[PDB]
Amino acid sequence: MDKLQLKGMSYSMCTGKFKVVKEIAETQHGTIVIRVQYEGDGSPCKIPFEIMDLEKRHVLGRLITVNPIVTEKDSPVNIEAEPPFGDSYIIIGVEPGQLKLNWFKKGSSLEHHHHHH
């Protein structure tokens, strides 16, 4: 009704918030998958995402599952996106409670290190 830019595979726009259901996964093809449950109110709507540059804190990421969609406002939706390189914080949802996940990074993965005794 008031939209005119994403013609194709579109529905609405889950503007509420998002709960990560699973850490970003890798599609084994350069992309990654983020499973999260749409939080807020939206029903069959699209999922907010942000990974490009400027106010993205990144350089140039892509979305293979561009603005995915939830069907019941609680269906854990996985988002396939192509991270550029270095610290890649994928953003889901909208500022107002939107989510964030760092992936790719430089070369190391999962900084598993901690002192204790």
Curated annotation (Swiss-Prot):
Its membrane topology is listed as: Multi-pass membrane protein
Query: Which organism was this protein described from?
Result: Dengue virus type 2 (strain Thailand/PUO-218/1980) (DENV-2)
Location in or out of the cell: Virion membrane; Host endoplasmic reticulum membrane
Q: How is it modified after translation?
A: N-glycosylated.
Q: What is this protein called?
A: Envelope protein E
Summarize the protein's role. Binds to host cell surface receptor and mediates fusion between viral and cellular membranes. Envelope protein is synthesized in the endoplasmic reticulum in the form of heterodimer with protein prM. They play a role in virion budding in the ER, and the newly formed immature particle is covered with 60 spikes composed of heterodimer between precursor prM and envelope protein E. The virion is transported to the Golgi apparatus where the low pH causes dissociation of PrM-E heterodimers and formation of E homodimers. prM-E cleavage is inefficient, and many virions are only partially matured.
Give the intrachain disulfide bonds.
C14-C45
Q: How does it assemble?
A: Homodimer; in the endoplasmic reticulum and Golgi. Interacts with protein prM. Interacts with non-structural protein 1.
